[PDB]
Amino acid sequence: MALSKSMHARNRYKDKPPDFAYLASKYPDFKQHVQINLNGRVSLNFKDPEAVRALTCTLLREDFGLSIDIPLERLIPTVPLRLNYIHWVEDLIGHQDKSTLRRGIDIGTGASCIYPLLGATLNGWYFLATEVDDMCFNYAKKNVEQNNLSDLIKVVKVPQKTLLMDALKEESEIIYDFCMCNPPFGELEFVKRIIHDSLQLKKRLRWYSCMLGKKCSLAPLKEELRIQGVPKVTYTEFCQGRTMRWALAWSFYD
Ligand SMILES: Nc1ncnc2c1ncn2[C@@H]1O[C@H](CSCC[C@H](N)C(=O)O)[C@@H](O)[C@H]1O
């Protein structure tokens, strides 16, 4: 499948994208990173990671009420793009209500802990955040605690060679609804490790998903899943102008 306006229909920033002028007038700690371009427009220098951090932290504060602390030394996520994936998963696990508790896994949560944070806020989803990087693990366990989401999000430091399988030994939950992953920059080799772990977990997770960075990666993975005889295999492409990612998910369910 593929979504109109190249991004998910339920995305906040599809109809109402970020307004630099507005955010500068509200958050004077963001006003410092914004500069007036030639066209008179209020613009952020996307090269400066401190500027980009200021935007991402402000959009979380402004639109989700999330106050996060993230280091420059680590990846700065781009709020609207990550949000498409949150909505795609919503669609996959057939969102719809108050007594229907849905639980997922985030393979590589990052310093931000962006997916579990959005996910637990927007929908109240229980998450199992995994991390190999200590710095990332420290900041994520911190952002979760400071937004009092300690109850829904369970951040866990994990060994290097370990993925999905190994992580589901603490805690012991029978059925997980989804698992999202944003592979770090071979890419194909990573999702292949996810595919394999999914072959042994099968119906224990309703949906296994992966946000890809390269379109070339879709063709072999689509073929791998097909060779392994995976019943449902779904894919889409998201967008944020210059940026473009390819989310792919697969289920063993009829
Ligand atoms: N085998 C593995 N298991 C768990 N986490 C891993 C891992 N390999 C890498 N990671 C971690 O996963 C992260 C990938 S970056 C994805 C971060 C986040 N979801 C975002 O979009 O902001 C890194 O912080 C890295 O330390």
Residue numbers in the entry: 1 to 96, 99 to 187, 223 to 291
Please, what does the article write about this entry?
METTL16 is the second m6A methyltransferase identified, and its known substrates include U6 snRNA and the human MAT2A mRNA that encodes for S-adenosylmethionine (SAM) synthetase (Pendleton et al., 2017). Here we describe the crystal structure of human METTL16 to reveal a methyltransferase domain furnished with an extra N-terminal module, which together form a deep-cut groove that is essential for RNA binding. Consistent with the SAM-dependent methyltransferase activity of METTL16, both structures reveal a Rossmann fold composed of a central seven-stranded β sheet (strands β3–β9) flanked by three α helices each (helices α4–α6 and α7–α9). In contrast, we show here that METTL16 is active as a monomer, and it contains a large deep-cut groove that can accommodate structured RNAs.
Two constructs (core, 1–291 aa; and ΔN, 40–291 aa) encompassing the methyltransferase domain (MTase) were expressed in E. coli and crystallized (Star Methods). First, and most striking, is the presence of an N-terminal module (1–78 aa) in the core structure that is appended to the α4 of the Rossmann fold and that consists of three helices (α1–α3) and two short β strands (β1 and β2). Taken together, our two structures reveal an architecture where the MTase domain is attached to a METTL16-specific N-terminal module that is essential for activity. Indeed, when mapped onto the METTL16-core structure, these reveal a positively charged cluster (K5, R10, R12, K14, K16, and R41) that forms the entrance of a wide deep-cut groove. With additional contributions from the N-terminal module (K47 and R74) and those from within the Rossmann fold (R82, R279, and R282), the groove runs all the way to the catalytic pocket containing the bound SAH. The residues K47 and R279 serve to constrict the space within this groove, while R74 overlooks the ridge that surrounds the SAH-binding pocket. The complexed byproduct of the SAM-dependent methylation reaction, S-adenosyl homocysteine (SAH), is coordinated by a hydrogen bond interaction network with the highly conserved amino acid residues R82, D108, G110, T111, S114, E133, Q162, N184, and R230. While 20 residues between Q191 and T212 are not visible in the ΔN structure, a much larger region (35 residues) between F187 and G223 lacks density in the core structure. The full-length METTL16 and the core domain versions were able to methylate this RNA (RNA6) at a specific adenosine residue (A17) within the nonamer UACAGAGAA motif. Strikingly, a combined mutant with all five residues converted to alanine (MUT1: K5A, R10A, R12A, K14A, and K16A) completely eliminated RNA methylation activity.
